Write a protein that binds this ligand. Sequence first.
Ligand code: HEM
Ligand code: HEM
Ligand SMILES: Cc1cc(N)nc(CCc2cc(F)cc(CC[C@@H]3CCCN3)c2)c1
Ligand SMILES: Cc1cc(N)nc(CCc2cc(F)cc(CC[C@@H]3CCCN3)c2)c1
Ligand SMILES: Cc1cc(N)nc(CCc2cc(F)cc(CC[C@@H]3CCCN3)c2)c1
Ligand SMILES: C[C@H](O)[C@H](O)[C@H]1CNc2nc(N)[nH]c(=O)c2N1
Ligand SMILES: [Cl-]
Ligand SMILES: [Cl-]
Ligand SMILES: [Gd]
Ligand SMILES: [Zn+2]
Ligand SMILES: [Zn+2]
Ligand SMILES: [Zn+2]
Lengths: 404, 402
Amino acid sequence: FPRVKNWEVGSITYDTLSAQAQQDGPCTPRRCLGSLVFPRKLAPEQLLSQARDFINQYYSSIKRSGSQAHEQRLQEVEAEVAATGTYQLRESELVFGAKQAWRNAPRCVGRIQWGKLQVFDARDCRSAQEMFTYICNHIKYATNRGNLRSAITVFPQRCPGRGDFRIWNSQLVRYAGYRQQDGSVRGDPANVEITELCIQHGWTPGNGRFDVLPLLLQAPDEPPELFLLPPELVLEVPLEHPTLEWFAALGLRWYALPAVSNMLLEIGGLEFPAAPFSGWYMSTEIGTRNLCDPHRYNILEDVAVCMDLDTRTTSSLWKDKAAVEINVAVLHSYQLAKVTIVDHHAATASFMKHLENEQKARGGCPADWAWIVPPISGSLTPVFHQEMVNYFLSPAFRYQPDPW
Amino acid sequence: KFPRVKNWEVGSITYDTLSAQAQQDGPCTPRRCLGSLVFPAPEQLLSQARDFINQYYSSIKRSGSQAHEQRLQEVEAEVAATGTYQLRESELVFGAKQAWRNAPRCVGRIQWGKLQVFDARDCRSAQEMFTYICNHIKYATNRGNLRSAITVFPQRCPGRGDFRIWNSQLVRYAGYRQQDGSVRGDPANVEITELCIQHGWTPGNGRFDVLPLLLQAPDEPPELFLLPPELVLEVPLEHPTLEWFAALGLRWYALPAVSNMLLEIGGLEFPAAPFSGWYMSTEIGTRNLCDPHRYNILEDVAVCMDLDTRTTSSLWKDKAAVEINVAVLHSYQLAKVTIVDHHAATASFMKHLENEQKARGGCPADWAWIVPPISGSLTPVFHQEMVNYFLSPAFRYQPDPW
Ligand code: HEM
Ligand code: HEM
Ligand SMILES: Cc1cc(N)nc(CCc2cc(F)cc(CC[C@@H]3CCCN3)c2)c1
Ligand SMILES: Cc1cc(N)nc(CCc2cc(F)cc(CC[C@@H]3CCCN3)c2)c1
Ligand SMILES: Cc1cc(N)nc(CCc2cc(F)cc(CC[C@@H]3CCCN3)c2)c1
Ligand SMILES: C[C@H](O)[C@H](O)[C@H]1CNc2nc(N)[nH]c(=O)c2N1
Ligand SMILES: [Cl-]
Ligand SMILES: [Cl-]
Ligand SMILES: [Gd]
Ligand SMILES: [Zn+2]
Ligand SMILES: [Zn+2]
Ligand SMILES: [Zn+2]
């Protein structure tokens, strides 16, 4: 039972939940690999023990462990697996499982919201055009004219033999990244590959640096087909600064909806390789990571030139002043456009309260410090001085190999 | 089966073969990672001694030679005879630099080869210890052109108590509990301040009172020694364009000198071996001045800057924090005291990572301590995966002597 200290307040807790951690991470007593983005690498008897565990904690979460339909649902699963080698989740179990996957996500700072999640059951989806319709409904519901609502859409689970449903885009909304003669990129460099793919599966490449990519959607076996997102469905936010008048002249924009669509949802031994989920942005994701990363839009120096900041010397902290103004612009622009966003101080304060809730409710909370501390102003937030334990609980979102 | 390490900014991939040589166990298991935690005879002595001797003889490209085997035989002989052994001067210099090179939480390790090593293993009393420390501070400060240095006092020995410096750093500001239950001065030094007072020190009543040294000779109570004021170089803090900032009366000291860690070299333990370098500006501006459990000045500075502190979405914290760091850098440059900003320091660390991959096949590094506490992702270390592990020679934490 690890002792976990908050070095700002002095408080001590013990993480007992970590003892229930099953699937083993990348660290050993000899070397810590906590900072690696992708840890390590990516007889139906194990399915039945994973399913029992999931059922047991589903009934625990509704008081009803002991007697009654808890007893009864264990046999239904045993019977289902003995007869088919797999099983189906009840709608309510699927809702509970998607929420727990979010709640168990060690890299997510927005987990105070884990109980409010809309779950669209697309498990009877049997087509790519059907997929596209589900995804458009999701986007419509989650975007909600800028009053963003958390949502996940669960497509059919992997069955032994026969193919997987699969969204090839890493998020539902991505900007195109176009190479050229210099090998430099116009648009988002993080999306060079998926842009390449979209073109080589039919797409007419577009203008410049904020072109919404089409969706490559893969029904089982039948190959991926392109789908174009209607522009009125993709809500975007032009970036302006409240006092720097020229900032809008940079022509910067970002989209309103963060919707991860390449991760695998796993519940009770079942696997859902296409289960896109969405929330709302924390402002540093846009301002600091997407716009200021050197391997992304990399605008820091452009904004610094315009601010007349002394770029001749690192000790002027011109990078830091320009970054703060870019986050100010992001926050200002989303608020003006009435699009839900959260600054990193509000987000981290919410995560500390979530850490307190989880301590009482489950005896701990898996958290990945490197991902929970924001990428600017880290020690200014109350999560910097909080020791955290990282471990893997089920249900879970997991990385998976790309569908090529 | 060596960890693959990626830099996400550039796409660099390497493998840390050096971690396979890790000489102790950390807190992590395959079940759970504890990487973020702040605090994670004769036959084992011999294998640590043998390993260190081997390292030393490789560094002087004399491995397996005659000198090498004589040393290995002289050490195990002397361990048999006395239960311990003595390092030669050159071995001590090599081991002290290696302990710096091996420190995973140090971003300043590009400098690890330029370390002045003072051999104080002949020290006899607390009064000699005090004289050695004052020459260390004088040499290291060098009128503001700071030089890295370590002073090594006698090793731990069976039959005698340890030399110990009770102060966690050689230069520290007193922290005084108050009527308000509050703290006047540095809240991090409340415990040491109360010890100084109860060993006779007549306290002050300011926010930047330099603490006396509590120096403990073997099998003695600690003895109190006052630092001559002309020995402790301080920097008054001003801002280049916020003129009211100088009126806050803020100061910091020139010399960061850690004095409470244990130096382990080839199984030998030096409980007293204070080392000093120079500050990176975020330690002063962000940690010491802005931490809420420290001088906690951030809101007052923001209020003086006429920032909207009613809501966090104005980013008043980030803005005030940046200008406080600007004032630290400008003030130290004005006072002609060595200081490095976190952009320059993280960039030189990347060059250290590269030097070390070539020389040793890796570099132990603690990401959460290498990434600066502001602007982390604006620095090149943010996107650099790192492998944390314990090599020896090492600087280790040790329990307080009281
Ligand atoms: C509602 C508001 C939400 C906020 C503010 C939020 C915030 C974040 C942030 C900031 C990160 C990564 C840290 C970074 O990139 O800087 C993250 C990662 C993650 N989030 Fe959340 N999130 C939200 C909703 C959700 C939802 C609805 C789910 C799942 C149903 C979710 C699951 C995850 C997962 C699995 C990760 C790790 C993703 C990866 O490793 O690529 N989040 N979240
Ligand atoms: C010369 C310039 C130096 C710089 C710029 C520097 C910088 C730093 C920084 C920034 C940290 C901790 C992270 C933080 O405070 O944000 C650190 C920790 C450390 N440094 Fe360096 N340092 C220097 C010299 C030295 C020297 C000369 C030694 C030893 C010979 C050393 C050994 C250590 C150790 C052992 C730690 C970890 C301390 C602990 O965990 O309590 N450093 N250093
Ligand atoms: C649902 C959601 C909301 C929100 N505000 N942020 C997120 C996280 C988005 C995100 C955050 C991030 F840092 C990186 C990515 C790309 C995929 C990562 C990179 C390597 C491993 N996988 C995506 C999700
Ligand atoms: C990078 C980082 C992560 C994290 N979880 N916590 C920190 C704060 C580290 C720290 C920084 C610091 F300056 C002091 C301490 C506490 C030391 C104690 C106090 C009395 C005796 N020893 C701790 C940094
Ligand atoms: C030699 C040196 C130079 C420099 N610029 N900075 C340092 C590190 C200073 C420092 C940095 C820091 F974050 C904390 C401390 C206090 C002692 C720590 C707290 C928990 C474990 N031990 C001290 C050393
Ligand atoms: C090397 C390092 O693990 C990698 O750059 C991680 C660090 N922490 C992060 N934290 C967040 N929130 N987002 C990120 O993309 C990353 N990248
Ligand atoms: Cl994103
Ligand atoms: Cl310090
Ligand atoms: Gd001014
Ligand atoms: Zn670890
Ligand atoms: Zn980044
Ligand atoms: Zn701090």
